[PDB]
């Protein structure tokens, strides 16, 4: 009934600020940790337990750790408005960054900080009675996010064992870029994410920028908008554990329905009613229209086109005032479409969930207030195109050993580049082979 | 002659809640448990579904089981939830995960002993025990696994009683879960060996009943569960009220099953009509019989017109002449003679009970044994064969511990059941 969030590096901490702002405002916890009596009527009770624990005096504190190597984003949390909400031990900071080197984070610096992190996670896990997974937020483009995220997932996988680990990962966008060494870090990251994650959700900053320009009416967006959209998606997926509904979905049934083979666990994510308040009065938002929206590639939060592949499984989460007959009519209409294709070995392609709590509205937000929403996570062979674009940039740089001396100086064998590139090549070939219809007798 | 009911999983718990509302209404039991009825005919058979606790109150002989407590908190929150005995709710701490092997082998064996202890305590308290009645879905996880586990244990412990099940099975058109074919195939394999009589319901058939016949504007699962509660409470009516021609569950089984594997039946209830239309047509025995055999009023997607009836049973409730019942059932047997198996001279049993369900002067419930049920199993087996040939999701089941040979055995047993129905479905001129 509980979930623990681990935030690593800059993107993960900044997305964490938006997530905890939303979870506080949705449950009704004030920034000082209290719950006034008049802010609770309207929603049921004990619902906070998934994300908060209360002290004997009734103060609430959240189940999260914030991890960074430079002392800057956490000092902003320490000096901001929510200083008193978090326990000070949860905000852990080192002295210096991994300088865009995966090797520096993994071998030299993260090895010093990792044992404090594991002790804090242990202190959280001891104060639980039905933990059912870890949610991890990080970027693979930077040094500490890649290196410490991989090292921590390996250690977590040894210590806790069967507990589930779900990752939200930001990969380097195909043409917008922020640093030169992004391909090397993303390639070295993918081996750990392949071995040590149960479901991996894909994000691209270029997709959320396109979504905020086309659907919302923002001419000059910034990272807070993207982080608020990600927070809405995670709140939608975890709502099934926290509020009453017609058809609930526990995270293990999600994992059981979405993953056909143990390595084929990379999924695309999309969200339907991303719309501005001025647009909201020109359009109705019925179940079938938002269900039609989640399948258009303009709705995706990853830069991939699902029309170049075949779907294996879809999981549709509906929240708010919806009735099952409308969900069934929508799914039957989607199944009828000719531009949507499923592999012939997956006849029953859909899983449905229905929850009564509508999405919360944040005072400074840009989304409109709406009575219903749908969120989709789907497994498709189209994801192979994202890796192919990362591999072309890696091949271009690696043909001349453009920067390898930095990685080799910090402790890495030159062989690991070739090993990682061959492992990602095998993952691409697996997604090509799994999507081939049927088999021949010869 | 006492019945013990078992409700398993969310669907089973919800249908059970609606059933106990209907039964508490018919015997005039207040939600506090106090008797407030208005005729002695209600008291003389109250023992059949309720046990009496001291100082007037009555408590219902039912066991509530589920793997996650969400539904139990929902039923305790329901309008009649207070009547249930607190010690009769058994629950675990983690869900079935929609996996048959999880529901049957790992979390099942941990709780099953406490459920068997409660069921034995309830059974040995009866002065004379009639059959058990079980409601569950076959497509789910805890419903399929723990329901079939409990059925096997109760059939070992009480082999001389009757075992009756009402079961909902996934539509090929309106499904909520991807791994439905495996759970359905393993559950049908368990039922064909374990069950004495099994009724099957498609949610699609109940939606077609609601939309075409009842013209409901915004149907909900409560309406679906009321149609099911209506038929289940109707089958037992002759056990607990007087009538001109009494009937019993064992008498139904003896007249309906020609050979022990052919024990899967279709159900229907006749007086269904929308509030706007009801002013235009009065109820009568010819009208109930005609709706009763109309496939629009049957609760499965398979159509009787593609098979033939081996046997059928009709239970009538109300004050009526025996001549009209006998001559109507003869007329239906004579008019549709091609749909009745010719080596049985008369296929229909009738029964008449004086006390109708509340709010209707008369009603009839229909139970039918028809070979068209083979089409439902063939469709589930086809979807299984598409998924099994490619090893689509087997690692979950194998990680729990299942041998693939279990899957091949279950497939072979269902295929033989389909073959046995298929030989009797078609004519043979020779």
């Amino acid at each position: 009934r509980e979930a623990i969030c681990i935030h690593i590096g800059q993107a993960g901490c900044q997305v964490g600020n938006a997530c905890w702002e939303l979870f506080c405002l949705e449950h009704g916890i004030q920034p000082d940790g209290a719950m006034p009596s008049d802010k609770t009527i309207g929603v049921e009770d004990d619902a906070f337990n998934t994300f908060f624990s209360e002290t004997g005096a009734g103060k609430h504190v959240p189940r999260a750790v914030f991890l960074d190597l430079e002392p800057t984003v956490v000092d902003e949390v320490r000096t901001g408005t929510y200083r008193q909400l978090f326990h000070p031990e949860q905000l852990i900071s080192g002295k210096e960054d991994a300088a865009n080197n995966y090797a520096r984070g993994h071998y030299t610096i993260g090895k010093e900080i990792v044992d404090l992190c594991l002790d804090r996670i242990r202190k959280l896990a001891d104060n639980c009675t039905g933990l059912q997974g870890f949610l991890v937020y990080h970027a693979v483009g930077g040094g500490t996010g890649s290196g410490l995220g991989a090292l921590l997932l390996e250690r977590l996988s040894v210590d806790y064992g069967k507990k589930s680990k779900l990752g939200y990962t930001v990969y380097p966008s195909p043409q917008v870029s922020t640093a030169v060494v992004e391909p090397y870090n993303s390639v070295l990251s993918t081996h750990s994410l392949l071995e040590h994650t149960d479901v991996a959700a894909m994000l691209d900053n270029e997709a959320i920028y396109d979504l905020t320009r086309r659907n919302l009416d923002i001419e000059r967006p910034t990272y807070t908008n993207l982080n608020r959209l990600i927070g809405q998606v995670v709140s939608s997926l975890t709502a099934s554990l926290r509020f009453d509904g017609a058809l609930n979905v526990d995270l293990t049934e999600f994992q059981t329905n979405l993953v056909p083979y143990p390595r084929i666990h990379f999924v695309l994510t999309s969200y339907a009613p991303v719309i501005s308040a001025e647009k909201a009065y020109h359009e109705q938002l019925s179940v079938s229209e938002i269900s039609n929206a989640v399948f258009e590639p303009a709705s995706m939060m990853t830069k991939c086109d699902p029309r170049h592949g075949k779907y294996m499984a879809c999981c549709l989460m509906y929240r708010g005032d919806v009735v099952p007959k409308d969900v069934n009519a929508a799914v039957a209409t989607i199944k009828t479409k000719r531009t949507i294709q499923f592999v012939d070995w997956s006849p029953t392609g859909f899983k449905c969930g229905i929850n009564y709590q509508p999405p919360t509205v944040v005072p400074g937000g840009d989304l409109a207030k709406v009575q219903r929403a749908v969120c989709m996570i789907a497994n498709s062979t189209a994801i192979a195109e994202v890796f192919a674009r990362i591999d072309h940039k890696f091949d271009l740089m690696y043909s001349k050993r453009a920067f390898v001396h930095w990685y080799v100086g910090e402790g890495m064998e030159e062989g690991e580049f070739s090993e990682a590139r061959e492992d990602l090549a095998a993952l691409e070939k697996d997604y090509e082979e799994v999507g081939a219809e049927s088999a021949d007798m010869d | 002659r006492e019945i013990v009911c078992v409700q398993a999983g969310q669907c089973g718990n919800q249908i059970g809640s609606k059933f106990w509302e209907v039964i508490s209404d018919e015997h005039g039991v207040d939600p506090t448990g106090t008797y407030q009825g208005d005729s002695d005919l209600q008291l003389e058979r109250i023992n059949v579904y309720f046990d009496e606790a001291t100082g007037g109150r009555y408590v219902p002989r039912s066991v509530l089981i589920d793997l996650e407590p969400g539904t139990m908190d929902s039923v305790r929150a329901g309008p009649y939830g207070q009547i249930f005995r607190p010690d009769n709710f058994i629950f675990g701490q983690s869900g079935a995960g929609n996996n048959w092997a999880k529901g049957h082998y790992t979390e099942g064996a941990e709780l099953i002993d406490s459920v068997l202890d409660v069921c034995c305590k309830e059974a040995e308290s009866c002065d004379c025990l009639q059959g058990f009645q079980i409601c569950h879905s076959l497509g789910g996880g805890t419903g399929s696994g723990m329901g079939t586990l409990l059925i096997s244990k109760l059939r070992e412990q009480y082999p001389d009683r009757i075992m009756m099940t009402f079961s909902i099975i996934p539509s090929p058109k309106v499904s909520d879960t991807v791994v439905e074919p495996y759970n359905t195939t393993l559950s049908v394999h368990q039922l064909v060996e374990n069950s004495d009589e099994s009724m099957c319901i498609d949610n699609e058939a109940l939606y077609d009943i609601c939309f075409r016949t009842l013209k409901l504007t915004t149907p909900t699962f409560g309406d679906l569960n009321h149609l099911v509660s209506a038929v289940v409470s109707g089958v037992t009516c002759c056990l607990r009220f007087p009538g001109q021609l009494n009937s019993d569950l064992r008498k139904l089984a003896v007249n309906l099953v020609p050979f022990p594997r052919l024990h899967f039946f279709m159900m229907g209830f006749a007086p269904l009509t929308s509030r706007g239309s009801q002013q235009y047509r009065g109820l009568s025995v010819p009208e109930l019989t005609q709706q009763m055999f109309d496939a629009k009023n049957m609760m499965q997607a398979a159509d009787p017109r593609h098979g033939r009836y081996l046997t059928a049973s009709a239970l009538f409730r109300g004050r009526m002449s025996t001549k009209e019942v006998d001559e109507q059932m003869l007329n239906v047997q004579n008019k549709n003679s091609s749909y009745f198996i010719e080596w049985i001279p008369n296929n229909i049993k009738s029964s008449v009970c004086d006390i109708p369900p509340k709010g209707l002067k008369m009603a009839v419930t229909f139970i039918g044994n028809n070979t068209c049920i083979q089409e439902m199993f063939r469709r589930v087996g086809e979807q299984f064969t598409l998924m099994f040939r490619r090893k689509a999701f087997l690692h979950w089941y194998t990680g729990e511990g299942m041998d693939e040979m279990e899957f091949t055995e279950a497939e072979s047993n269902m295929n033989d059941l389909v073959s046995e129905y298929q030989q009797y479905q078609d004519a043979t001129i020779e």
């Binding site: 009770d45 009735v323 009564y356 | -």
Partner: peptide, 26 residues
């Protein structure tokens, strides 16, 4: 009490969904 709040929420939901137009596009 939890039961009172759950019953109240369900009753208000039933009151809202009674209108088909509001169920569709409220």
């Amino acid at each position: 009490t939890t039961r009172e709040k759950k019953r109240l929420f369900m009753m208000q939901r039933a009151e809202r969904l009674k209108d088909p137009k509001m169920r569709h596009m409220g």
